[PDB]
């Protein structure tokens with residue numbers, strides 16, 4: 001049981017050891033396509049690649065490669081697409097993927113610049129009147145509105161397939177205060193943000209999978225998805241004790257390498273799930289508490 005295990009790990013101070021155990025047991029599958037010479041410039045990090053078996057394929061004959069993985073959680077019945085922060089030459093591919101996979105929501109957990117470096121291209125328009133056209137993939141993207149909070153921004157975007165003139169509303173959930181290789185400020189601010197994504201309907205099975213990305217698409221992204229899946233599993237069964245967080249993470253790691261990047265991100269995942277469970281088991285008022293504690297205004 002997660003809460004007992006949590007206290008047991010804290011007491012012995014063995015988070016590093018627990019985390020390394022997961023790293024040792026984690027799946028290892030080929031990433032041949034990712035490592036092809038022609039794809040070198042499509043990858044942000046040399047050591048972060050999608051497995052061939054779970055990679056998202058672009059619907060194009062030229063080159064179908066993007067650094068993105070489908071995390072298909074069978075038992076939970078929810079899917080996520082985890083991807084790197086798009087590069088200056090892959091923003092058209094990124095939006096092509098969003099279109100083709102029928103995603104309603106995009107979750108961004110990093111800033112464009114972190115620690116003096118550019119961890120992600122400016123892939124969405126910052127101003128209504130300055131829309132973006134991705135010539136390579138024939139897509140248009142317009143900022144419709146934004147709602148800026150203290151530590152996260154929600155944007156409404158219109159994505160248009162210029163080939164067919166069909167348009168879709170994409171919701172962009174941008175968490176601005178989560179450091180690379182770090183953790184959110186509190187379980188509350190993380191949970192407040194996750195529930196915003198949930199409340200939008202972006203995670204509905206009636207949609208294609210939500211797109212989740214930080215810089216590499218494994219650390220912060222893995223943490224977000226792990227917490228969400230654990231809460232959903234618990235919710236389906238209405239049974240917090242049925243959820244084995246480490247087992248869930250190992251299942252996720254069958255679909256993308258390196259999910260959760262530090263022992264403290266793992267420890268934070270426990271905190272978030274333990275706290276989120278209060279809502280699941282029907283203390284609705286806790287949502288209000290998170291909103292307040294998060295200081296979003």
Ligand SMILES: O=C(O)COc1c(C(=O)O)sc2ncccc12
Nearest residue numbers: 180181182214215216219220261
């Ligand atoms: O998302 C995270 O916490 C860590 O993600 C990564 C990086 C970053 O955000 O600068 S750089 C990097 N290199 C290899 C694997 C993950 C990451």
